[model samples]
Target: PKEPEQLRKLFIGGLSFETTDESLRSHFEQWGTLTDCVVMRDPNTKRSRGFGFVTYATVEEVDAAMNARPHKVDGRVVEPKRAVSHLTVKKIFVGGIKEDTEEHHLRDYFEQYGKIEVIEIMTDRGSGKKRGFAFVTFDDHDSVDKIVIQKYHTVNGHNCEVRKAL
Candidate 1:
């Protein structure tokens, strides 16, 4: 009997709304021999839970797949990561916000860059004036760069800067 190749762990994210394990395996197999594929799904909705993990037999195969891939999952621009490194942008700090900023509008403002993960706004409880800042979360860090390069100065004509949450 032949020994199986050494396996490597990878983190796959930004899966499309309708992605499934079979689809992900079909896609990843094109890049390298897949040992296993799992797409985390919502327990209630039974849809992709927006992330998952994959195990391949070798690092070279994983890297080749990562490099050649266009960060896509089920037609969505996905963000892939190494399970060990697990690097990602969970939230972004937005300063110099307008006084009348609303959560919906804030989320809408950033969605232009990519899928909006979540939006959180901080306000002064006493005066109810805008606290001059807010935070935005993207499904992945790519949007952080996208917003920094392209959408930074576009929102409300105010200079917007985003960085990893502290």
Candidate 2:
């Protein structure tokens, strides 16, 4: 049997920037139950760069799509291949924080967009003070995009700007 990690859906690329999860699911539904679909986005720009994934319920569904269209998604041609392993978790840096920003408070603010997998606040070792910047990790790539869009809001009167960890 293939390793658990080996079992993943293959996908095509070069899709339209506006491809939504709903649209992909709806279009691929004729083949099988789509376990998940997501379009990759720029961590800073938050714009689609013409790549995404569609996971079918079974390998047969994946095979059918590959054999039928193979490289095209919704008429756009893309090279379909096995899903990549070990997708690196993107760490987003959030600044412009209020001095009193607590980890819980920060988590609470971003959790609305999606589930936060990890959050670390950079601290000045000598002063034991928050550097007014923190790092956050989202469980899903799509959630990261959502967080990027939702960062331009006032949290407790303080504006938050989130971007790639740097």
Candidate 3:
């Protein structure tokens, strides 16, 4: 008798900007059945970010895709590799911010060290006023090196506090 199939995920990068979810699924289906496929997009502009994720119904399928790398999607060479799990505590708290500071500004500044997964600015629930602080999460934990080294870094003329999230 055959054993059960284990679900596994893959990170597919180097996708063509024109590739859509359907197109990605179709291209990857040759190796095995996919449980999920997603082409990341910009939330504001709804444009493809040139990368996506693919989930297989079995680990074997993930291996198959990985072994068959240098694959082509929409005439563009693409690569599929194992996906990295999200870090449990890759978040940091930022405080003493100016009210007018924008999310993009923070992203532009902090992204120099590593890729930021999220940036959340705390706000007063009742009055909807900026809470003068925020949380920034990086894709890698090593980002704290530069972040802490530049503690109390000035952004938009405000000296913001930076510390690992507890």
Candidate 4:
């Protein structure tokens, strides 16, 4: 019997709506031997989920890809980061924020569930307005999971979608 090869995967986000599996493979193949490449999609509509995963044959290839930041595919700037099967950090990404969303308010709301380490409401560079998303770091990773599993986290009248940060 042979030992199974260890696979390292990367989380590729901020993908263009027009991106396809073939296109993803083409851009990443230059880095190393890719065992797999997938652009997640909606099963019903069959549309790109705006994110994907790329598995490399080696960990070195994963590091190389991360160093090669500011990646572009099909002229769209994409974010490539290391992917983890299970989130170990107490960080979460909150989306669907309104412009009026405030950080203190976010902290106050999330505090009920757990002690938050930090709350950041993403803002535009030029306008400095809320970017309709935020990242919340809780003291305990379990709270992050609790919020996600609860599936009813909201912010500013919007059903804030929560996901474990990459």
Looking at model 1, residue 134 earns an lDDT score of: 89
Task: Identify the runs in model 3 with alpha carbons over 4 angstroms from their true place.
Answer: 1-7, 85-166
RMSD of every candidate to native, in Å, equals 11.8, 14.0, 14.3, 13.7
lDDT of 3 by residue, 1-166 (tens): 3223222777777899999999999999999888889999999998999899988888668657755666899999986655542322568888888588789878888887667999998889999889889899988554653466442687767888888786
Task: Report the Cα lDDT for residue 138, model 2.
Answer: 76
lDDT of candidate 3 vs native? 0.77
Work out the TM-score per prediction.
0.47, 0.48, 0.47, 0.48
Q: By the lDDT metric, which is better: model 1 or model 4? A: 4
Over all chains combined, what TM-score does candidate 4 have?
Answer: 0.48
lDDT of 1 by residue, 1-166 (tens): 3223322566777888688889888888877777889989778988778887777777667667656657566788876765532335657788777676678767767786657877878878998767878888877665564354333454566666655575
**Sequence-dependent TM-score of model 2:** 0.48
> lDDT per residue, candidate 2, 1-166, as tens digits?
5324224475546777777677666767777777788778889998987777778777667656654554445666665555543233456778878577888877888787557889888889999887887888876553454355342855556788877553
Which whole-number lDDT from 0 to 100 does residue 136 have in model 3?
Answer: 92
The C-alpha stretches of model 1 lying farther than 4 A from their native spots are 1-7, 88-166
Q: State the displacement of the C-alpha of residue 76, model 2, in Å, after optimal TM-score superposition.
A: 17
lDDT of 4 at 4: 28
